[PDB]
């Protein structure tokens, strides 16, 4: 039965990513006074299937990989880590309940970075390596601020247990207590997934299937990060007898956050590498440090230290 749970966590997420592609297309189009995919299936519901079938039939070209071995491991690592990050998330009950689930999430995101380095290095392409290293630099800065914000917000949770966040936000959403950290956290999540305006347009050598899987892993990471934001700040009511209510509310929150991800994508011009790092090092980092000081001092000075257990 546990294997059934694993499958019921993996397969639906992949299907959700597939339909998220269509949702993004339509949302961006209608924000551009356009109709997204509307011919391929009713309201484009068959568009993701068409895309997948076309991709898995397109001639895969070989990118002269210096190390097929590594070139193949990078997609596997990305997808596997993306799937694993969903496991600790409490939709009211988590699949695997870890006392330190938050740190597990952070570590999984940290390993995911290697997929980028491995892809570029094995690609045997100067432009590929340059772009990969730029991605390394971008994810480098997000991790620091992300970790600091997560620690600061969990200073009121009482532990790194993800399930406890529901109890902490039972009465009031965490955002009302830590809204600046929420802003920086959302922007940091955008930076992590390289979603605009933190893209670096112009791992492209990947052909068809490989590319498709990398794309799936990236979008699954988008959905997972939005879910993490939901659980952290947008707490949801959980009735122990009827968990479906929490599941519905949480899903709606995650969908809203992904829609905001697309909404930002088609609202702002893309940053520049210098500007992105002069944000994530000279604007966010000092403020994150100050807010971490504040969120350490506040529970002590207000006698609001959360329970350890």
């Amino acid at each position: 039965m546990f294997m059934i749970n694993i499958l019921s966590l993996i397969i639906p997420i992949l299907l959700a990513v597939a339909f998220l592609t269509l949702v993004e297309r339509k949302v961006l189009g209608y924000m551009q006074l356009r109709k997204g995919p509307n011919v391929v299936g009713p309201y484009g519901l068959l568009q993701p299937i068409a895309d997948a079938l076309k991709l898995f039939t397109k001639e895969p070209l070989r990118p002269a990989t210096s190390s097929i071995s590594m070139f193949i491991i990078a997609p596997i690592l990305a997808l596997s880590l993306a799937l694993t990050m969903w496991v600790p998330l409490p939709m009211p009950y988590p699949l695997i309940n870890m006392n330190l689930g938050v740190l597990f999430m952070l570590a999984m995101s940290s390993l995911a970075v290697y997929s980028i380095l491995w892809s570029g290095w094995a690609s045997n392409s100067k432009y590929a390596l340059i772009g990969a290293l730029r991605a390394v630099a971008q994810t480098i800065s997000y991790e620091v601020t992300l970790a600091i914000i997560l620690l600061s917000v969990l200073l009121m949770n009482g532990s790194y247990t993800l399930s406890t966040l529901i109890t902490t936000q039972e009465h009031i959403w965490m955002i009302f207590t830590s809204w600046p950290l929420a802003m920086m956290w959302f922007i940091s999540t955008l930076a992590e997934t390289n979603r605009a305006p933190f893209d670096l347009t112009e791992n492209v050598e990947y052909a068809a299937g490989p590319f498709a899987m990398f794309f799936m892993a990236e979008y699954a990471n988008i959905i997972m990060m939005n879910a993490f934001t939901a659980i952290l700040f947008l707490g949801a009511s959980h009735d122990p007898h009827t968990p479906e209510l929490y599941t519905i509310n949480f899903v709606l929150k995650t969908l809203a956050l992904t829609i905001t991800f697309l909404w930002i994508r088609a609202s702002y011009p893309r940053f520049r590498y210098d500007q992105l790092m002069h944000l994530l090092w000279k604007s966010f980092l000092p403020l994150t440090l100050a807010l971490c000081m504040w969120h350490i001092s506040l529970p002590i000075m207000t006698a609001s230290i959360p329970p350890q257990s």
Binding site: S141, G209, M213, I296, I300
Partner: protein
């Protein structure tokens, strides 16, 4: 065993998909692109490495800052608060040093 099972299932699923995406789709015959990778022949700028070493050190300081949630339960709250503020001040000082001096060039 449950977490190990999850890891195994995820890894195997990803590897199976990589199989059906790297070897299955290339079975279909698509002629032959007799096209050689014409190559005929180094930007090791500090601008990149600096971003890396500084991240390593800040990540190290972040590691020292991780046990803070459990450290708030100590009876010696004043001492713990002072030490935590000290570590945060040192992080800020390191950032300030790099910013004030020739650093944060990214």
């Amino acid at each position: 065993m449950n977490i190990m099972l999850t890891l195994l299932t995820n890894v195997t699923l990803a590897s199976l998909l990589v199989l059906i995406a790297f070897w299955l789709p290339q079975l279909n015959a698509y002629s032959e692109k007799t096209s050689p990778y014409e190559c005929g022949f180094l930007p090791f700028s500090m601008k990149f490495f600096l971003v890396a070493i500084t991240f390593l050190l800040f990540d190290l300081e972040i590691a020292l800052l991780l046990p803070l949630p459990w450290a708030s339960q100590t009876n010696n709250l004043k001492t713990m608060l002072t030490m935590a503020l000290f570590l945060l001040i040192l992080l800020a000082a390191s950032l300030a040093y790099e910013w004030t001096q020739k650093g944060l060039e990214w």
